[PDB]
Design a protein around this ligand. Structure first.
Ligand SMILES: O=S1(=O)N=C(Nc2cccc(F)c2N2CCCC2)c2c(F)cccc21
Lengths: 290, 254
């Protein structure tokens, strides 16, 4: 005679094909997550998950991923069952671990960073075994919360690769190619309708000469991330418009690699125009003086 | 074996009525009973906790919101009474409706997805909101909108010292319009007695790459006044090539 109660734990676990250790892991992680949820708090779950462009991660102060939303596979290939209860460091790039540690500890509780996680899904949509796992950059934004123990509740969004775009891009968005110097090597025509520059007069120009100085700290930061992990999402910054004024902008940068020699070739940027030209009466740089 | 035992004791701790040690076959059955004794809103709470976001279903035809969750209040400081009975165009900065029209259009994009940034009115005060959603059933948009994170003036110069960027505060600090400083060297506005000093500073800031140096000199204002000015300056380097993009100065009166 043997034990079939192990199957009854997986059934009441919100299952069949799992080893005993996995059912233990899932049950204990669910109970810890429920404790934290009673801490924070005092059907539509389908809508909330399908509307997300990322996955929710509740990670303990020791790196234990005690909760991952069901859609994580859709972005990472690795499933909710495969990762729950395991350490985040076992599934993230080592060069990011320390940064991850810095975001897991401790007066402010807001966290906003970029990490590299294992990915076993391909652009074709097929799922791949664990041995061949690429690195996927996740923009993680969330909160560190002490509960009675500290957790990190983050939303982790992938940065859409500029080649494979599943999202319709409105007319307020334009593409731009850059060298690793961030100098312009290509731009959309839409910029002429949106900011006022001709796509030709920007070639060979350093992008550091076209954003408002007050945003420098942001930009360089993004640049470093873009060069360290391959993708980045900038904050909201100001690009100086052609005939005075500036435009608010948030761009997703992605390092492109030459598929033949596997060398960093360029950086594609998907720039979302966030406003009309503001303070157009004010000139800021020499490039604005015609 | 040690890890399965540790799992058993951890599950024993997580069950209250069990911690109050019944075997393992028993321990699993107590855990099953605890599971039977106990969702969907637990996702709304985690989402608001992580990204300060709220769910909303609007109509793709008229823009009228068919559903707004209570999470719109901690995010936008607006009650559901305002959102309900209105359209998304009324809750959005007037310069985004065009963009909204492109996102709420179902002529070509169903079940498709949508991702866009827009300014929503809160509390006129607007906040930037990142909206990610999808089309549903004529057609609706189910989306989640989340939030996110004069004594001186800043200026940029070339290696020579020519104004290549001037922030507007100069108009208050020195009296010149930005076009009056742009194109000319900073030494031109310096008292001759001090010019060499300033030059030496601009000769050191480049030779002390990245380091900050403070010079003090007399600046000619538009009213032709010699205002004493302390300029702290450093060279900005390209993060990938370390080449000096420009010299950044913070020109401060007195
Ligand atoms: O206003 S801009 O001249 N500055 C741009 N970006 C930029 C400048 C310096 C350092 C950086 F890291 C960046 N990035 C932003 C995230 C990707 C890299 C930019 C752009 F990406 C497109 C159009 C116009 C401009």
């Amino acid at each position: 005679k043997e034990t079939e109660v192990f199957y009854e734990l997986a059934h009441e676990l919100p299952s069949s094909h799992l080893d005993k250790a996995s059912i233990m892991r899932l049950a204990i992680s669910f109970l810890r997550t429920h404790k934290l949820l009673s801490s924070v708090c005092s059907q539509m779950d389908n809508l909330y998950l399908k509307a997300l462009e990322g996955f929710i991660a509740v990670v303990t102060q020791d790196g234990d991923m005690i909760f991952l939303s069901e859609n994580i596979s859709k972005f990472m290939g690795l499933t909710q069952v495969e990762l729950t209860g395991h350490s985040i460091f076992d599934f993230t790039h080592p060069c990011d671990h320390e940064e991850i540690r810095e975001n897991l500890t401790l007066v402010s509780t807001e966290r906003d960073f970029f990490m590299r996680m294992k990915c076993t899904v391909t652009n074709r949509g097929r799922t791949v075994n664990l041995k061949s796992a690429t690195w996927k950059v996740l923009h993680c934004t969330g909160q560190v919360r002490v509960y009675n123990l500290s957790c990190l509740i983050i939303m982790c969004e992938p940065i859409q690769h500029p080649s494979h775009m599943d999202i319709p891009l409105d007319s307020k968005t334009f593409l731009s190619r850059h060298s690793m110097d961030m100098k312009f090597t290509y731009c959309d025509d839409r910029i002429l309708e949106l900011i006022g520059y001709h796509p030709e007069e920007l070639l060979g120009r350093s992008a550091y000469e076209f954003y408002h100085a007050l945003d420098s700290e942001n930009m360089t930061k993004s640049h470093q991330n873009l060069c360290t992990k391959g993708q980045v999402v900038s904050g909201q910054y100001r690009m100086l418009a052609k005939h005075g004024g500036y435009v608010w902008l948030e761009t997703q940068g992605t390092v492109i690699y030459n598929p033949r020699n596997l060398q960093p070739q360029c950086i594609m940027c998907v720039n979302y125009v966030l406003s009309e030209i503001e303070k157009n009466d004010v000139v800021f740089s020499m490039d604005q003086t015609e | 074996r040690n890890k399965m035992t540790a799992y058993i004791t951890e599950l024993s701790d997580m069950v209250p009525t069990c911690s109050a040690k019944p075997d393992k076959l028993t321990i699993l059955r107590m855990a099953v009973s605890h599971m039977k004794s106990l969702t969907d809103q637990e996702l709304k709470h985690l989402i608001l906790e992580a990204a300060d976001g709220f769910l909303f279903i609007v109509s793709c035809e008229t823009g009228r919101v068919v559903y707004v969750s209570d999470s719109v209040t901690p995010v936008l400081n607006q009650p559901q009474s305002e959102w309900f009975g209105s359209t998304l165009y009324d809750q959005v900065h007037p310069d985004d409706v065009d963009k909204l029209r492109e996102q709420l259009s179902t002529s070509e994009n169903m079940g498709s997805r949508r991702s866009f940034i827009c300014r929503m009115r809160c509390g006129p005060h607007f906040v930037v909101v990142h909206c990610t959603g999808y089309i549903k059933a004529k057609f609706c948009l189910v989306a989640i909108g989340r939030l996110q994170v004069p004594t001186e003036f800043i200026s940029r110069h070339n290696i020579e010292g020519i104004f290549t960027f001037v922030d507007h505060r100069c108009v208050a600090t020195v009296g010149y319009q930005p076009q009056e400083l742009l194109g000319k060297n900073i030494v031109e506005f310096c008292h001759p007695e001090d010019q060499q000093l300033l030059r030496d500073s601009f000769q050191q800031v480049v030779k002390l790459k990245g380091q900050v140096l403070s010079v003090m000199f007399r600046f000619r204002s538009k009213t032709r006044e010699w205002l004493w000015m302390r300029t702290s300056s450093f060279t900005f380097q390209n993060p990938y090539s370390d080449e000096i993009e420009y010299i950044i100065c913070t020109n401060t009166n007195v």
